[PDB]
């Protein structure tokens, strides 16, 4: 009867203290960089959460008879806010930090209930918005955790998209290619590419190396390439100790991404610490089409010491309450014994109040 | 880079290097010569758990074939060798399939007893539950499946299935037990799969080794 | 396509700033009084959330085939933690602050998604645990908001329960009475009590607000009953101590406040405010709340909707684009003091940030109002 | 006759499913006591249905995993499977009539020698997903699992689990790779399982054969 | 893949439908004339009503009440509700049903998540004779629908186990643990569990000699044989075994005294019919007194059910030409009157518009006749 | 209240069941001999399959796939799938069905959320004659099951509206808005909407003179009458009206050219049968070419359905014989049962009062009334 579902756990006090502190400092790190905190709804009509699938928990709304979902990802929700609810005539920055639910664990995660923290920059077209976001993402990881041994993977979907356009491929061909690239299934890719098929093959074979790629290969393609090269340089400048790599056929959620792709990987981890991208017009479903770029992470991935508790005796004598108040004022956790309870009623006690002074044991 | 010590320590953390997962048996036999061309050799007979190599930044695991995609996608191995059948049945979404090593060639096929086609929904016995469903779906069809792990040729003979889906090489095991191969679903061979994170952050180490394996195959 | 469901809203930045600040300060106020923050699961097997409803959203778990619920109330979850997960051999204190979901709005609330903050004290039998909790609840409301014109309603279910026991009423009779009392349907109560010890049952409803008038109309039989008298003393002692500690607070009595009678076992406490039907916060003694999950533990606690204790505009400083050290330095100092600073992007001018209130400008870099 | 026809319909007789390898070796002498013997060497044939010295008994040689599947579905009337395999598959749809007392081992937890218990929910690597969950549940505990098929001792060394659940015999494979056996979950041995329908309607044929296997084991 | 049906779910196309429909009607009618009145139960109910006896039940929210519904997985508890509350007949009552039930996952090694459950229920008679009727009806229905050739009847009685639990003073936990061991016939574990258990050798005997009344009575203690309730249950089984063997000499009958499927709501005789090369029985039933007590009055009750799919020739179609001439319509009407499937060509369609046509209505020497091809 | 059924859901107890079952069989059989082959459709399907043509469908998660299922609300799209994909008969095909469908809330002023839907489908013939057959079959079935005394057949044709939409070059939004106005026959709004609409006076005429072909043709422009497709639709309706009036001289037949129920998937003739003192028709159907195109091949299709409870409770007679297995008694029981009588035997020591609903007794063995 105590059993929790698979992928669902309590966050008990030791872990909670660490995550809570981490949550606040991340929100605050974003706040002072202009990213305004919002709380998104936990439930929405399914169509609103599905504008970008199996992962979303679904329930019927008794008031409307329509299907709801529990949020699996706040990215489309903030898009709705920027597109419809707060149609700010200019650049806008928001952030969020809250539980999302998945019907089954995603990304080799232990939990069906990750604590998703993220940031969104709307209303600026140029590559510089992406540079800020990458910089913010890195800065937040550095603040929360560490970039020691970390790796930044930069991509750009405009390369593939441009080549699809120039070659005049159909939607079915484009979709089939994107699957092959995302699996980097190079044997199948060879067969599938045998119009401009040798460039499509080159894009997959030499995905990690701009030089080798340019050797083995249009305004829009060149603009995408410049956008990537400029980003690679600026980020390498700002973060000299950070490993940065390239993958021009990183096409995760290709359908709604429109430019630069960025994720941060760490030692001994399959899942990135954080991932984001350019996704112009993400909110067009909801109203106005807005330039948009952003990232998110699981806060548990950037995250358990013991808690110290002071025990004072029962009483309401002024000098005792005064000492308790001063202690609490300094951020100490103080409790008073209840009734005839002795100190053994608080077995996790680390300190005692006994002039009134605090001593260990 | 060179290492001749058979008891070279390759235990614990190996983030600086590559963990290579090999399928035991036939795939191991045909893989080891290829790896030799990339300067990666064992220093012991496995048949005699983690193994060091002639390369200090490469260690080898010998796994059951089923575990290879699991290990690779989870990043417990940086790269591995698995049959196309095993890979596609497991799900290939979280790894990169960089090379066809062109070894352990066979075919995934349907098979049955001059058996009359049965009237209702077909029942397929197979270890390849997902590939069976995709294949029949491509024909505009859908089936019942019973998942078995082995002795697939038995299933029709004792009424567990109307047909089977299984890998077929010589197809003598089938002919022996009164079965015949029917339709070819796909060509199967061993493949080099790479963990996505590993691929992105260990290019310096991977790229030359992958290139050498490619040269060796062609 | 932008439509949200009824009772569901975004919390946009102006409101979010206020609530977030309120959330942190409340958690911290509880922390230093020994209440350790936990995060409870948003989903659980339905039986775990229902140990004490129509209100719980229900979904199938694909992994088990069992029915889940989304949490409507964290009280039973922390009970599970104390009963099974952390079986601390002694007194334990926890708190929580998170969204709960209701299939329909409860308590005349606008939202189907209130932000429930609460605290739980396990492992102490005596009335003093309840006194602490009442004191903590009041302290938290005072800290978050104000007790000016607030009203504390104190009750105790032991009075009714004791009289049910002494009179030998059946479960059906007890259940029917509890409905009548909770509606204070005094005409029906008159009729229902006419036919054992019915005049005391009627007295309990008629003189619910006045201990003196109640004791005058109660039979000596029931006043002499040990358990009834213990419950009455427990209430009288609490009324006195709380009135002492909070002289500026209005305190009342209602001995037939029997909300969720089935799992409450002692003192009842709630705080009401002007021009609000719903209390700001409500709690009670509920011994053995976690027995479903393992060990039976004395327990008392409260919760509130944090939106009910809660929207000023946000100030933003705009600096120009650049990475010159003296500029970044000034930005960093500003951000260090908790100011919200952004830099212009690309060729954007100041009109790209129309909600800008302040500028960083070279005069040395200074902040001035726009 | 080694080529006695035992193909097609065999409702009049018993289809006996044996686990290949060690279990086969130790089972065949027991079966001999019931007058049931093979008439050729399985290891040097490719065919998978065998006749016996008994006209109403034919033998299938299966992977151990398939034995419960075949038996519960009635493709075999009875079979020999490890207690571990049976209980992991689910034992609700067969009858477990005999402990053959062969292939004895223990299902156990195991991990790195002297490792401190990690904080938070444990991750267990195992092929015994269900038995792992039941065991931890009996302790009032709950875990994450990753299903693997073999070389279980590797999982902790490459960070796939904090602990493993696996069958342990000599326990030398563990000691070798810096692991140790921790808790015994249950004692494991090969068992004779019977299809429920078969048991109910083929008593005449089953009862003497089962009794003879029982006698054989007691010695 | 827009045509894809979910796993365990299939159309019943015309060839199969004809056979099942015919089978459905004849079964209902066979029951009708034996006093079993057809009812249609609801497809959806409040979950508590369908769960009075599961993971198997599909669950949906009722928008009108906010309460959880289930789709029926089993009509047994529904008819119990009808007998207990809706039609509180003061005396014996007999009902039957034939309809789809849904299971979230296939049960009983079934191909379908949507079996066609046919069943019968006899309420209001305590004695063993009600069970004898029901067994007899079940067998009769299977014989009528299909065949009892090579079939096997398994008879049990939960009163034996229940009586011994009572006499030995076992706890509920012990009783529950035993029932699991018996239902798996896990005899090695049963040996260990019974060793230092009160009256444990009788508990072991019950499992070891479950199939053989003689061998069982030889290994049972005189203590338990003397127990009134145990002996009454044994006599009830022995009398049933004799009567059924008499009425159906061509039927194989067996015993299993530790058949304890759904022990919690069964209270007496257990009965199921097995067939060659099938793991699942063709039909299963039992005594379950007080099954409807959840819904009102406590009623003696016994009944069975089967999947009708467990008990497909081509269809003949006559094609006539387009027209409304009286002599043609007359011939069509006479044909249809005899149960033939007749269609007329539409518009300018020729006979190739009906490629599955087996017969033609054609005017020969001035009269309309049916001929093949 | 443990016996409570949900709203709109009822048992069909024996008296009613006998009538409906008999009605069900005779309807299936009436269709069978006219070439309509019985099928059973699935009770559950992936939601996309049941929704190819909404709120009415009950929705559940499939544990095996994780995809959303629906319980069938209407078998029309299911048989379309069968004809389009499962049985791709190269020629004309006829099928029928009779089974429960479920609605989340009652539809069509129905008492039940669980109507017994019987219907028939004719696939693979383009011309109007397929519709004439279907109308004829529908009427024939109602006549067989019930009666057409005082019944009214409403004939329509969506091709008129659709043709005029095409000729006038209206947008989809305009077309959709018009179809709503027509379906409500909101003539004041229709006047306003058709003012300053291209060919608006014909659109208005279509609504004002919907019931009268003569009055309509008089008020329509020569432009639209000359349009090939409009005229073909009008001829199709006129020819149907004549043939049906011939075959059923005693039947009231009317016209409504702006009957546009489910306009989006209907493509030709519309037909429904109304009865005295009933808001909902007894049966309704239409031409819906390409209904199954979602599932595969595009097929001409026309069909109808009804709630069988709407076409539909006498007492049941039971014979009681004594307990026994004497040959002459069993013989008499068997002969009685052979003639279709409901015979039971007394159990054990039960007397005749154990069967209080007994109408007859077996007492040579003879049957007499009680
Ligand atoms: Na984002
Ligand atoms: Na609480
Ligand atoms: Na039944
Ligand atoms: Na229809």
Author numbering:
A (entry chain B): 6 to 57, 66 to 207, 210 to 232, 239 to 324, 328 to 378, 383 to 389
B (entry chain G): 4 to 51, 55 to 119, 121 to 225
C (entry chain A): 6 to 57, 66 to 208, 210 to 324, 328 to 380, 383 to 389
D (entry chain H): 8 to 226
E (entry chain D): 5 to 57, 66 to 323, 328 to 389
F (entry chain C): 5 to 57, 66 to 324, 328 to 378, 383 to 389
Task: Reproduce passages from the article.
The first step of histidine biosynthesis in Acinetobacter baumannii, the condensation of ATP and 5-phospho-α-d-ribosyl-1-pyrophosphate to produce N1-(5-phospho-β-d-ribosyl)-ATP (PRATP) and pyrophosphate, is catalyzed by the hetero-octameric enzyme ATP phosphoribosyltransferase, a promising target for antibiotic design. Histidine allosterically inhibits ATPPRT in a negative feedback control mechanism. The catalytic subunit, HisGS, harbors the active site, possesses a low catalytic rate on its own, and is insensitive to histidine inhibition.
To start shedding light on the structural underpinnings of AbATPPRT catalysis and help inform structure-based inhibitor design, the three-dimensional structure of unliganded AbATPPRT was determined at 2.40 Å resolution in space group P21, with the full hetero-octamer in the asymmetric unit. Each subunit of the AbHisGS homodimer interacts in a head-to-tail arrangement with the two active sites located at each site of a crevice between them. Each pair of AbHisZ subunits also forms a head-to-tail homodimer. The only noticeable difference in conformation between the side chains of corresponding active-site residues is the orientation of Arg29 (Arg32 in P. arcticus), found in the open conformation in AbATPPRT as opposed to the closed conformation in P. arcticus ATPPRT, which is characteristic of the Michaelis complex. The open conformation is seen, however, in the unliganded form of P. arcticus ATPPRT. Here, we reported the crystal structure of AbATPPRT, which will enable structure-based design of orthosteric and allosteric inhibitors of this enzyme.
